[PDB]
Design a protein around this nucleic acid. Structure first.
Ligand SMILES: [Mg+2]
Lengths: 144, 147
DNA sequence: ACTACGTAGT
DNA sequence: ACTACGTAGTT
C-alpha cells in the first residue's frame, strides 16, 4: 500500500485491465473507483482513484478534476461519507498525494493529485452526491 | 480456439486472474466456467473448464472430477439447468472423446492438464430443480499436480 | 443487450 | 454477504 509515485510506473503508462493496476500496486480494487488505507493514527486516507466514465466526473484538459463520490446507485439514495468517500475527505487535511488513473489500452496513469475540497450536491432524484476537487501536483510531466 | 494442449502452457503453470487465461488462449470466457466451439460438423464441443468454487464440484486428489453444469441460479429463484451452450458442449464431448483443458482455482488458478468427459447425469437438488453433473477423468501419462 | 464458476476489500 | 468507475463473446 504505497502512497504517491510507484516504482517503474511512469505518467502516460497504459494498461488494458483493472487487474494490471492491482498487479503493479497502482490501484488495488477490482471494481471500486477509490482505493484507501489506514494512516499512522488509524484514520482512513485515499491512495488512488479511477475515472473511467462510471459517473459524471469533470475531466477537462486542466490541472483540476472533479471526482464524484461512490454509492447511492448512480433505487436512488444518498451517498455516504464512509469508505472511499471518507478516505478522500480525510485526504484533504492529510494533504497526501493520490494516484489518478483515467479511463480511455483502456487506462492511463495521470500522475499525482491533491484533494483540495469536497461538497454535497442534490441530484434530480433528490438524493445526495459528493464531489471532490482534485488538483494535479505541479512539476510533473504532461499527459497528451 | 485450440483443442488440447496450448503452446507454452505447461501443467502446473499458475495464473493470478481469468483474463490471463484468455490472453494465453487457455480459456476464453471472462466469467463462464465452460468454453466451447463448433466442430467440423457444427455441433458444439467443449475446450476447457474452470473449477473455482462457483458450484459444488467434486475435486478430490484423484484422476476423476465431478463438474457441475452451469445455470439454474446455483452459484436468484432456482430453476432447471438446461442442456444448451456449455452444458451441451460438455455432453457432446463425451461422444467426440476430445481433450478438455481443466483449470482449477486456488496466484488463483493452476492448469491441471487434459481430461476426457466420460459421462453426465441429472440430479434433483433440494429446491426441486434439475442440475447436471459431468464426470471427467484425467488423461493418463501426464505430469502430476502437487496437492 | 444478453449470460456468465469475475474479483478485492468491508 | 455485500459493495462496487469490471469484461468477453455472442456460439
Ligand atoms: Mg445469445
Amino acid at each position: 500500500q504505497i502512497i504517491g509515485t510507484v516504482p517503474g510506473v511512469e505518467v502516460g503508462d497504459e494498461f488494458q485491465y483493472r487487474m494490471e493496476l492491482n498487479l503493479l500496486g497502482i490501484h488495488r480494487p477490482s471494481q471500486s473507483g477509490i482505493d484507501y488505507m489506514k494512516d499512522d493514527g488509524g484514520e482512513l486516507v485515499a491512495t488512488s482513484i479511477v475515472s473511467s466514465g462510471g459517473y459524471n466526473d469533470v475531466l477537462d484538459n486542466s490541472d483540476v478534476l472533479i471526482y464524484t463520490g461512490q454509492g447511492g446507485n448512480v433505487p436512488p439514495k444518498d451517498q455516504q461519507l464512509v469508505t472511499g468517500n471518507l478516505a478522500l475527505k480525510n485526504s484533504i487535511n492529510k494533504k497526501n498525494p493520490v494516484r489518478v488513473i483515467r479511463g480511455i489500452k483502456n487506462y492511463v496513469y495521470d500522475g499525482l493529485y491533491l484533494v483540495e475540497e469536497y461538497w454535497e450536491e442534490t441530484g434530480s432524484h433528490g438524493k445526495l452526491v459528493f464531489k471532490f476537487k482534485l488538483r494535479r501536483i505541479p512539476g510533473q510531466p504532461e499527459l497528451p
